[PDB]
Structures are given as structure tokens and as C-alpha cells.
Symmetry: D2
Subunit: 295 residues, 4 copies
């Protein structure tokens, strides 16, 4: 038999970093979870029990901490590029590094209208993520994303005009609840290496911010024809506002809220325009995906 593909590394490496301003006394914290997987001339560790080609995953973990000690950890797109570049420059037989980072929220607390210098709150479970692929002789590919952004609108969602055949029982509607957990990814144009990534550093936070804002405002303002239609609108705007983005992908569940017919009880009216109490459904859920690119 033959090794067709192989990668190995360390997952679930939790990292905290604090930045302390002597001058102001203000502290700023960063917490992430890191995955690093390596590819290279390592097939003999699998086939021949040759561990000489293995950079121990324990050493990978060490490297993550040391790199965080010696470099900025923000924006995550920069830190991931620095970490992956290290592995391929450092080891002659390692030719690709795959770095995934999840950035956890630590939002500064405001106490008495004043931001506190060293106290933070996890204000949501929403994440900011990066996937960075560093490949010898092919540059640095970065996919940035937000995930875990949970939203609901209580009206101004519609779904009518869909295919109707003998498998269909769903009624057309002109007014429903729409709720989802947003997963949005923007894929950057290939970068030639670290210098190029460093030259674009301000764009990373700005674009994350823009993707978030557009996502929020479009969801809230669109009188949605369907999940499909609304998510296309978000993707189009982001592409229009950042030219270094090649594609935008969205993955949106439809988390259903069902009406409850209470007419069996004292003629109680709780459907259609009288609908006030609903049953949120844990499963199943619609799942709608789109990848939008440039024309």
C-alpha cells in the first residue's frame, strides 16, 4: 500500500496573552485555541517506524507558546501566518503548515460608564476564526471567518413560490420568524509570503468588522424572500467593499419556530395573525450554503 496523504500536529492548544501599558496601566487580553498540522517528507514515520522525520507534537505545542511570546497575536491572520511560516522555514523536510485559530471574546468591562483597565467579560460565544495554509513555494492562503453569531427576526421574513408536488405539505407564508447561527467565511487572494501579509495588516480587522456589520444590517433590513436570497445580498456587499477578497461563503441553518394551534382549547386563537406563542424546534433544521465570487 502507499501513503497518499498525511498530516499530523497538535490540536486544542489554548493560549492566553496579556499586553500591559506601563504608561496608561491599561491591560488587554487575548485568548485563542490553536490547531497546527504539518505536511512533508514524513511518510517513513508511517511506513518504516522512522521517527527521525517527526517534529514531536509536544514540540509543536512549545513552538506555539514561544511564538506567541515573541510576536503579536493579533490580528489572528498575522499570527497564523507567522506561525506557519516558521515551520516550513525551520524544517527542511516540512513543506506545508496548516494553522487554525479560534479567537475567544474578552470584551473590556464598562463600570460606571468608564472602561475598566483590566477586567473583561465574555460578552458572547461568537468566534472570530482563521484558517492559514502555508505552503512552500505557493505562498500563504488565508480564510477568515465569524461563527456562532445567533440572530432572530420576528417578522419580515417570507417563503412562498417554492416547488409543490406530492411530497410537499408546507404552506406558503408571507410572515414568519427567521432565526439562524451565522457562519461566514471570506477567502483572501493568495499572499506571496510574510512581507505581503504584513503590508495588509490593517485590512484584516477592518474587513472582519465590515463582514459583521453587513451581515447584521442585511439580516435586519431585508424583507427576506428566503434564506438563499438574503445571504446572497450579504455576500455581494462584502465583496464590493474589500477587493483583496476572492470569495465569500455563508452557511446558515434555518432554526424553525412552529406555530401552535390552541383552538382545541376554548377556541383560543394562536395561529396566523393571532400567533403569539411558538414552539422553537431543536431539530431538524434547514441548512443553506452559498459561495459567491467575482464576475
Amino acid at each position: 500500500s502507499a501513503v497518499k496523504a498525511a498530516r499530523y500536529g497538535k490540536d486544542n492548544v489554548r493560549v492566553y496573552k496579556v499586553h500591559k501599558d506601563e504608561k496608561t496601566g491599561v491591560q488587554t487580553v487575548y485568548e485563542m485555541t490553536v490547531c497546527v498540522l504539518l505536511e512533508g517528507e514524513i511518510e517513513t514515520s508511517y511506513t518504516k517506524a522512522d521517527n527521525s522525520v517527526i517534529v514531536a507534537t509536544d514540540s509543536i505545542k512549545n513552538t506555539i507558546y514561544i511564538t506567541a511570546k515573541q510576536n503579536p497575536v493579533t490580528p489572528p491572520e498575522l499570527f497564523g501566518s507567522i506561525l506557519g511560516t516558521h515551520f516550513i522555514e525551520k524544517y527542511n523536510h516540512i513543506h506545508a503548515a496548516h494553522v487554525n485559530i479560534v479567537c475567544h471574546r474578552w470584551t473590556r468591562m464598562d463600570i460606571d460608564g468608564k472602561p475598566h483597565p483590566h477586567s473583561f467579560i465574555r460578552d458572547s460565544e461568537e468566534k472570530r476564526n482563521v484558517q492559514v495554509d502555508v505552503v512552500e513555494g505557493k505562498g500563504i492562503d488565508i480564510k477568515s471567518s465569524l461563527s456562532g453569531l445567533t440572530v432572530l427576526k420576528s417578522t419580515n421574513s417570507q417563503f412562498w413560490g417554492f416547488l409543490r408536488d406530492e411530497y410537499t405539505t408546507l404552506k406558503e407564508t408571507w410572515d414568519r420568524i427567521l432565526s439562524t447561527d451565522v457562519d461566514a467565511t471570506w477567502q483572501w487572494k493568495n499572499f506571496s509570503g510574510l512581507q505581503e501579509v504584513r503590508s495588509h495588516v490593517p485590512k484584516f480587522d477592518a474587513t472582519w468588522a465590515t463582514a459583521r456589520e453587513v451581515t447584521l444590517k442585511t439580516f435586519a433590513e431585508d424583507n427576506s424572500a428566503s434564506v438563499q436570497a438574503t445571504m446572497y445580498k450579504m455576500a455581494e456587499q462584502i465583496l464590493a467593499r474589500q477587493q483583496l477578497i476572492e470569495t465569500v461563503e455563508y452557511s446558515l441553518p434555518n432554526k424553525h419556530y412552529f406555530e401552535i394551534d390552541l383552538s382545541w382549547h376554548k377556541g383560543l386563537q394562536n395561529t396566523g395573525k393571532n400567533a403569539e406563542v411558538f414552539a422553537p424546534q431543536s431539530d431538524p433544521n434547514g441548512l443553506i450554503k452559498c459561495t459567491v465570487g467575482r464576475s
Copy 2:
């Protein structure tokens, strides 16, 4: 053998309610998860296969929706009291109702600095909870709580002066990270029944707010001697600000962030005053509990 205790009901009943202002066009949503357990003269369902004494848990679920249709669902302390009172008044053989409610966050979105009329965000996984016990001839006992409030301060926590013996390896410190997930419960004085609960309705939201504020400000401002000392300070204030509270209980994990010694690598200095990169620990964790009452 003999039935010493028995309760039965329905758990994990998810409920959504929307309120719509004709006038303004503003919509407001509520989402909760409800548990209702009943006690009474029901032992023969266990011992004799007598189902006649059983109010089907399916009917309990129905009752939850109908009650939500016909009554306010906020504050949860009121809605739980109304729901539990129903069961004991309605069924002659049911003498206690236990209602647990978890209130989920749906915070109105602000778009362009303007609050949106019908779009919401789950801005955190923090919950507002109530436990309501309705007991025939003994009134209504309510425990209110907040849970899932996750915080961190990066300095102004200490821990020195603890017992040292042959089981001790922990070093005293005058500067550490302190992070926790706050669970805080305030127990109301017994209420005689629904009228009394309705007369105090404005106090429920106000007290939740106060408990939250005090928790936040004390955590941020206290130069903490230990988790014990800091949580006592929070409990004392809440009791001072709401006289209808008999006790306050706190349950606080200590989620450890460990220093990482990097001196083995190029003499890198990452401990004590040079500590910048830390390893968050998933387990084990300290767990500190306090119940504070009136003197």
C-alpha cells in the same frame, strides 16, 4: 416498600412569545425553557398502576403554552408563580408545583445607532433563571438567579497566607489572573400567594439588575484576597439593597490560568513580572460556595 417521595412532570419545554405594539410597530420577544414537576396524592400511579391520579405530562406541556398565551411571561418570577398556582388550584389532589424557568437572551439589535423594531441577537449565553415552588397552604417560594456570566481580570487578584503543610506545593502570589463563571441566587421571603407576588412585580427586574451590577463592579474593583473574600462582598451588598431577600448564594469556579516557564528556550523570561503568555487550564478547577443571610 413505600413511596417516600414522588414528583413527575415535563422538562425542556421550549417557549417563544412575541409582543407586538400596533402603535409603534415595535416587537419584543421572549424565549424560555420550562420545567414543571408536580407533587400530590399520586402514589397509587406508582404502586397500583392507577393512572387516574395522573395529569399527563403531555397535558402539562399544553398547559404551559396556554398559560403563556393568556398571561405575561415576564418577569419570569411572575409567570412561574401563575403557572404553579394553576396546577394546585386546578387539581384537588395536586398539592405542590415546582416550576423552573431559564430565560434566554434576545437583545434588540442597534443598526446605525438606532434600535431595530423586530431584530434581535443572542448577545451572550448568560441566563436569568427562576425556581418557583408553589405549595398548597404554604405560599410561594421563589429563588431567582443569574448563571453563565463569564468574567476575567488580568491583575488585582492575590492569594497568600493559606495553610501550608506537607500536602502543599502552591506558591503564594500577590498578582494573578482571576477568572470565573458566576452563578448567583437570591432567595425571596415567602409570599402568601399570587396577589402578594403581583404586588412586588417591579422589584424582580430591578433586583436582577442590581445583583448583576454589584457582581460586575465588585469583581472589577476588589483587589481580591481570595475568591471567598470577594464573593462575600458581593452577597453583602445585594442584601443591603433589597430587603425582601432573605439569602444570597454564590457558586464560583476558579478557572486557572498557569504561567509557562520558557527559560529552557534561549533564557526566555515568561514568569512572574515577565509573565505574558499563559496556559488556560480546562480542569481541574477550584469551586467556592457561600450562602449569606441576615444577621
Copy 3:
């Protein structure tokens, strides 16, 4: 204000122990998760910032490992008693120790019909648990339990004869699916101390085994009138087979499987006696509890 109650300690302490038979070469492993909470004359750590009364939770963790090194870790009822007794004997101001243990399954693998000497499988997520309360001058109270035992029977469950009023929509049935996750606790008579617990050591594993067997056989053989009726039958048997048990408690969800009406499609018959495809419901669920004691 005043401290009404206080306890503190360490949670989520994971422990592995291996036992190695020189003679046979057979190895046996144990893995548990331990919680230890202490009570005593410790109020001044809360009120006065007096850490001198605090046995650091870090030291508690150390103590757990050392105790496991020097004593048997099985049965968990014995190990918990030894651990809690340590704290109250060792520290003059500590008067109660609360030890919770979760025992994780590592079942020996059989390879080629032969049990392997050192390879194991987590054959299920079912747990064996103990809660041990060690109180100065009041002995040792032990509650043993099994949890996470998930079962289903596809027929020979009934539910008819329940209360019917204007909140009822559930139809009586003489044939349904019954599925649950078993939580069963047996509470031992108070023990005077460690000697007494050691004298009963063989009974702990035997009784766990009996509780499991009875639970399984009764669920499978009872033509169940309801969850109530069936669980009473299990509790009664266990009490009959172990006299040192004072009470048995069961907590059983009813995890509903709903019929699906497919008659709207080509007159397809999938209800009642033609019911073949069902929709498992994630929520809500019935919840039925019983505590059975001696007459």
C-alpha cells in the same frame, strides 16, 4: 450580614490508576473524576480575608493523587470514604468532607475470544457514581448510583386511564415505544466510620451489579402501565435484595418517539398497527421521579 453556609474545594479532578500483576502480566485500569468540597470553621476567609483557615484547593488536588497512590481506588465507595475521612482527621477545623466520584468505563478488550492483558475499550458512556459525606461525629453517609444507562423497548409499553380534562389532547394507547436514560441511586444506612465501611466492602460491587440487573430485567419484562409503575417495581426489588439500603431513588425521562402520519402521501399507512417509521423527539420530555423506602 452572616455566613449561613460555606463549602469550597476542587472539582473535575481526573485520575487514572493502573494495577499491574507481575505474576500474570495482566494490567487493570481505573479512571475517575473527583470532586471534594470541605466544610468547617472557615467563615473568616470570607468575612475577614483570613486565608490561614484555608487548605488550598491546589493542596486538595495533591491530596487526591497521593491518596490514590497509597490506597485502593475501588470500590469507589471505599476510596471516597478514605479520602473524606482524611480531611476531617487531618485538619482540626474541617468538620465535613463531601466527595463525589464518577467512575468511567474501561472494559477489557477480548481479541480472538481471549481477554487482552492491557487493552481496554470505553464500551459505554454509562457511569458508576458515589457521593460520600464524611461528617465529624456523625459517621459516613454514602449514596451510590448508576447514570447514563440508555434503553429502549419497541413494544409492551402502555399508557391509558390518565386524567382527561380540557387541557388534555393525548390519546390513550395500548402499544408504544418506551425509551429512557436511567438514573438510579441507592442510599446506604449510615456507617460509623472507616472500619465499618471496610467491613462491608464486598457488598458495594455486588449491589451495583444487582441494581443494574434488576433495572435491565424489569424494564425488558414489564408490560409497563406507565413509567411510574415500572420504576416502582425496580426500586422494590433492590430493597428486597440488600438490607443495608435504606432508600432507592429513580429519575427517568420519557424520551418520546412520535408516530408520523403519511396518509397525505398516496394513502401511505404509518400509524397505529401500521406504524413503522417514527420521529424521535429531542424535547420536551416527560420526567418521572420516585424515592422508595422501607415500610
Copy 4:
């Protein structure tokens, strides 16, 4: 902008099916969770608000139940092929169907050494999975897998001979614990369509069984040089025993169990050959992947 890729459907569709033998009275149950995502000429639902091209995800759900009513649901490789073929044959504009199925364990109980006719136990959280891609004019691609198989061996694992540089702190060892959660996937040769899949039906369960057996026996018997080496051995055997398999992929975490140095306490010896108590580590973990194909 332009739609580069699009798929939509229904996720988390839970399904139960029972099979009842009139003759024997024996019942057999199946429970799965189904995801179906469709691709086709559906871009205008995204760009033009044209819902006419949309087969409602609600109808997809209906279709899953109806198909399960009218066809075998086992082996999952067959049921997935039947379901995906339906969508592409039925709808002219739908050209690919992606079906993912998770098969949940319901193992027949043995009571008194006799298998029970209608009672089952979830004997483990291990899953059997399939991914089936049905593409108009390109046949049926099936990936089969097992996941959630958690194992541990307490000796006969080694790790020495790895790369050592200034990032390395890990000590070589000739005796350690090895624990993992097995994820193994076998990819079938492309099938031309349903007839071909039906002709190979007996091979699906047999191969799942073989992959399981080989995985178990190799883990238990290999004096492992590393995770890499051991997993290569498993993949090679499976390929040798089933010729219709093109590739085998394994994804194996290394769930670390750390020694604990107790020498600081009364010279207690708990390392190296005296190692008896270990601390299981929740994170980070090694992650090792391999795809093995034919030479």
C-alpha cells in the same frame, strides 16, 4: 458577483424504524440522523428571489420519512444511495444529492443469557456513518466510516527517536499509555448506479465489521512505535481484505496521560517504572492523520 457553488437541504433529521417478525415475534430497531444537501440549477433562488427552483427543505424531510417507510434502511450505504438517487431522478434541475447518515447503536439486550425480542441498549456512543454523493452522470460515491470508538492501552506503546532541537522538551520513552478516539473512513470504488450498489450489499456490513476488528486487534497487539506506524498497519490490512476499497483514512487524536511526580511528598515514587497514578489531560492533544491507498 456570481454564485460559484451552492447547496441546501435539511440537517439533523432523526429517524427511527422498527422491523417486526410476525413469525418469531422478534423486533429489530434502527435509529439514524440524516442530512441531505442538494445541488443543481438553483442559483436564481439566490440571485433573483426565484423560489420556483426550490424543493422546500420541509419537503426534503418528508421525503426522508417516506423513503424510509418504503425501503430498507440498512445497510446505511444502500439507504443513502436510494435516497440520493431519488432526488436526482425526480427533479430535472437537481443534479447532485449529498446524503450523510449517522447510525446510532441499539443493541439487543440479553436477559438471563437469552436475547430479548424487543428491548435494546445503547451499548456505546460509537457511530457507523456513511457519506453518499449521488451525481447525475457520474454515479454514486460512498465513504463509510466508524467514529467514536474510544480505546486505551496501558503499556506497549513507545515514542523515541524523534527530532530533537531547541524547541524540544519531551523525553524519549519506551513505555507509555496510548489512548485515542478512532475515526476510520473507507472509500469505495465509484458505483455506476443503484443496481451496482445493490449487487454489493453484503459487502457493506462485512467490511464495516472487518475495519472494526482490524482496528481493535492491531491497536491491542502492536507494540506501537508511534501513532503514525500503528495506524498505517491498520489501513494496510483493511485494503488487503476488501478489493472494492480504494482508500482508507484514519484520524487519531493522542489523548495524553501524564505522569505525576509525588517525590516532593515523603519521597513517594510515582514515576517511570513506579508510575501508578496518572493525570489524564483534557487538552491539548496530538492529532495524527493518514490516507492510505493502493500501490
